[PDB]
Scaffold this active site. Structure first.
Site, PDB file in Angstrom:
ATOM      1  N   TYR A  69       0.826  -1.214   0.000  1.00  0.00           N
ATOM      2  CA  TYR A  69       0.000   0.000   0.000  1.00  0.00           C
ATOM      3  C   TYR A  69       0.864   1.269   0.000  1.00  0.00           C
ATOM      4  O   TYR A  69       1.893   1.351   0.675  1.00  0.00           O
ATOM      5  CB  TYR A  69      -1.064  -0.063   1.108  1.00  0.00           C
ATOM      6  CG  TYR A  69      -1.658   1.258   1.574  1.00  0.00           C
ATOM      7  CD1 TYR A  69      -2.551   1.984   0.772  1.00  0.00           C
ATOM      8  CD2 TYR A  69      -1.364   1.756   2.849  1.00  0.00           C
ATOM      9  CE1 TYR A  69      -3.098   3.178   1.214  1.00  0.00           C
ATOM     10  CE2 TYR A  69      -1.914   2.941   3.305  1.00  0.00           C
ATOM     11  CZ  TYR A  69      -2.779   3.652   2.491  1.00  0.00           C
ATOM     12  OH  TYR A  69      -3.317   4.847   2.965  1.00  0.00           O
ATOM     13  N   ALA A  70       0.469   2.224  -0.828  1.00  0.00           N
ATOM     14  CA  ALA A  70       1.241   3.430  -1.040  1.00  0.00           C
ATOM     15  C   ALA A  70       0.434   4.577  -0.466  1.00  0.00           C
ATOM     16  O   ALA A  70      -0.492   5.082  -1.104  1.00  0.00           O
ATOM     17  CB  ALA A  70       1.525   3.630  -2.507  1.00  0.00           C
TER      18      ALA A  70
ATOM     19  N   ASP B 138       1.377  -1.639 -11.372  1.00  0.00           N
ATOM     20  CA  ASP B 138       0.744  -2.224 -12.557  1.00  0.00           C
ATOM     21  C   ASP B 138       1.622  -3.358 -13.111  1.00  0.00           C
ATOM     22  O   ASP B 138       1.635  -4.428 -12.506  1.00  0.00           O
ATOM     23  CB  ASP B 138       0.379  -1.164 -13.588  1.00  0.00           C
ATOM     24  CG  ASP B 138      -0.213  -1.751 -14.828  1.00  0.00           C
ATOM     25  OD1 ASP B 138      -1.417  -2.098 -14.790  1.00  0.00           O
ATOM     26  OD2 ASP B 138       0.534  -1.862 -15.834  1.00  0.00           O
TER      27      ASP B 138
ATOM     28  N   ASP C 151       4.695   0.875 -19.862  1.00  0.00           N
ATOM     29  CA  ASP C 151       3.491   1.582 -19.467  1.00  0.00           C
ATOM     30  C   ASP C 151       3.640   2.595 -18.300  1.00  0.00           C
ATOM     31  O   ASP C 151       2.742   2.699 -17.447  1.00  0.00           O
ATOM     32  CB  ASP C 151       2.420   0.530 -19.167  1.00  0.00           C
ATOM     33  CG  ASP C 151       1.025   1.121 -18.983  1.00  0.00           C
ATOM     34  OD1 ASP C 151       0.710   2.195 -19.555  1.00  0.00           O
ATOM     35  OD2 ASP C 151       0.231   0.486 -18.258  1.00  0.00           O
TER      36      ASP C 151
HETATM   37  C1  LIG Z   1      -3.587  11.792   1.439  1.00  0.00           C
HETATM   38  N1  LIG Z   1      -3.923  11.333   0.079  1.00  0.00           N
HETATM   39  C2  LIG Z   1      -2.989  10.513  -0.673  1.00  0.00           C
HETATM   40  C3  LIG Z   1      -3.567   9.090  -0.631  1.00  0.00           C
HETATM   41  N2  LIG Z   1      -4.988   9.087  -1.027  1.00  0.00           N
HETATM   42  C4  LIG Z   1      -5.528   8.029  -1.672  1.00  0.00           C
HETATM   43  O1  LIG Z   1      -6.735   7.897  -1.705  1.00  0.00           O
HETATM   44  C5  LIG Z   1      -4.828   6.883  -2.342  1.00  0.00           C
HETATM   45  C6  LIG Z   1      -3.912   6.016  -1.757  1.00  0.00           C
HETATM   46  C7  LIG Z   1      -3.565   5.068  -2.706  1.00  0.00           C
HETATM   47  N3  LIG Z   1      -2.698   4.049  -2.509  1.00  0.00           N
HETATM   48  C8  LIG Z   1      -2.517   2.981  -3.332  1.00  0.00           C
HETATM   49  N4  LIG Z   1      -1.691   1.966  -2.940  1.00  0.00           N
HETATM   50  C9  LIG Z   1      -1.442   0.892  -3.707  1.00  0.00           C
HETATM   51  C10 LIG Z   1      -2.085   0.852  -4.932  1.00  0.00           C
HETATM   52  C11 LIG Z   1      -2.006  -0.156  -5.914  1.00  0.00           C
HETATM   53  C12 LIG Z   1      -2.838   0.347  -6.921  1.00  0.00           C
HETATM   54  C13 LIG Z   1      -3.099  -0.337  -8.221  1.00  0.00           C
HETATM   55  N5  LIG Z   1      -4.355  -0.423  -8.690  1.00  0.00           N
HETATM   56  O2  LIG Z   1      -2.124  -0.787  -8.825  1.00  0.00           O
HETATM   57  N6  LIG Z   1      -3.363   1.532  -6.568  1.00  0.00           N
HETATM   58  C14 LIG Z   1      -4.283   2.265  -7.470  1.00  0.00           C
HETATM   59  C15 LIG Z   1      -5.616   2.645  -6.866  1.00  0.00           C
HETATM   60  C16 LIG Z   1      -6.077   3.782  -7.765  1.00  0.00           C
HETATM   61  C17 LIG Z   1      -4.840   4.483  -8.285  1.00  0.00           C
HETATM   62  C18 LIG Z   1      -3.674   3.566  -7.981  1.00  0.00           C
HETATM   63  C19 LIG Z   1      -2.927   1.873  -5.343  1.00  0.00           C
HETATM   64  N7  LIG Z   1      -3.138   2.933  -4.532  1.00  0.00           N
HETATM   65  C20 LIG Z   1      -4.286   5.362  -3.844  1.00  0.00           C
HETATM   66  N8  LIG Z   1      -5.056   6.439  -3.602  1.00  0.00           N
HETATM   67  C21 LIG Z   1      -5.970   7.042  -4.615  1.00  0.00           C
HETATM   68  C22 LIG Z   1      -5.867  10.226  -0.636  1.00  0.00           C
HETATM   69  C23 LIG Z   1      -5.175  11.599  -0.610  1.00  0.00           C
HETATM   70 MG   LIG Z   2      -2.957   2.382 -14.361  1.00  0.00          MG
END
Ligand SMILES: CN1CCN(C(=O)c2cc(Nc3ncc4cc(C(N)=O)n(C5CCCC5)c4n3)cn2C)CC1
Ligand SMILES: [Mg+2]
Length: 258
Positions: free
Chosen positions: A85-86, A147, A129
């Site tokens: 998680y990022a 991805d 990509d």
């Molecule tokens: C403080 N803020 C930064 C984090 N915020 C988020 O909502 C957030 C955290 C994350 N973290 C996350 N971690 C692992 C991921 C693996 C993926 C993936 N699908 O590969 N994602 C996607 C979700 C939508 C865009 C990217 C991931 N997103 C995505 N979002 C949209 C809200 C505003």
């Molecule tokens: Mg993508």
């Protein structure tokens, strides 16, 4: 692993083939992101080998600038990827937030990208990509590529909003590692300017602009950035610098961190 095992939280991202959710592992209280893809729609689009390229590759690469895939499982209806998680979300959202970046943030991401791609290319894998919606931020603002699939291995091979894709890929010709290098150029530019250099209004227009390599620089773009991007964005792939030449390039070092 199974669904029960996790409590699911809010949704993090839109239904590409399903959504990705914040989630917590009951036993250890581990926080992770749960990509949820409906089998139905994968088969209907026949991209299961892409899935089965995301899984193998992302699990066997270990690098601080590459998002980690921890495991997977499926049920009747859906396939579940257990991801790192990022916490700070995507570079895409950050760009929308700040509209463009300064040179220091830009050189820093290009550097973190170059190392991650350097590791990648050493095991002959090419991303193909690196849009900003596939670049994620760790807790320290560390940039992490996610991805994978479409993807990798050797020379190659096979609607991708075009923008980050190089000419050889767009015509359907043969491609190698250098595809990623062009993408670094599109990225570099996008960061400084806020819009990718072949951004156009229609797929067809963009396609022209890429094949022709038509972009110009707004006046605020410093001599050295143009130098890096100009060098990275060549039609002939073999006249694109290698990553260690990028990592060197005087402008990157005048501005990166570490
Ligand atoms: C403080 N803020 C930064 C984090 N915020 C988020 O909502 C957030 C955290 C994350 N973290 C996350 N971690 C692992 C991921 C693996 C993926 C993936 N699908 O590969 N994602 C996607 C979700 C939508 C865009 C990217 C991931 N997103 C995505 N979002 C949209 C809200 C505003
Ligand atoms: Mg993508």
């Amino acid at each position: 692993w199974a669904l029960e095992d996790f409590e699911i939280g809010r949704p993090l991202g839109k239904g590409k083939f399903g959504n990705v959710y914040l989630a917590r592992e009951k036993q250890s209280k581990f926080i992770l992101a749960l990509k949820v893809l409906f089998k139905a729609q994968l088969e209907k689009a026949g991209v299961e080998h892409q899935l089965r390229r995301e899984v193998e590759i992302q699990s066997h690469l270990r690098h601080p600038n590459i998002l980690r895939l921890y495991g997977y499982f499926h049920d009747a209806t859906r396939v579940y990827l257990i991801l790192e998680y990022a916490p700070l979300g995507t570079v895409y959202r950050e760009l929308q937030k700040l509209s463009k970046f300064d040179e220091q943030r830009t050189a820093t991401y290009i550097t973190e990208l170059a190392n991650a791609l350097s590791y990648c290319h050493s095991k002959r894998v090419i991303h193909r990509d690196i849009k900003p919606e596939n670049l994620l931020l760790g807790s320290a603002g560390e940039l992490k590529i996610a991805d994978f699939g479409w993807s990798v291995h050797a020379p190659s091979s096979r609607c991708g909003t075009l923008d980050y894709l190089p000419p050889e890929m767009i015509e359907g010709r043969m491609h190698d590692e250098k595809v990623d290098l062009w993408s670094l150029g599109v990225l570099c530019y996008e960061f400084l300017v806020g819009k990718p250099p072949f951004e156009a209004n229609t797929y067809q227009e963009t396609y022209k602009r890429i094949s022709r390599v038509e972009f110009t620089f707004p006046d605020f773009v410093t001599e050295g950035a143009r130098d890096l991007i100009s060098r990275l964005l060549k039609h002939n792939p073999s006249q694109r610098p290698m990553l260690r030449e990028v990592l060197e390039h005087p402008w990157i070092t005048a501005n990166s961190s570490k």
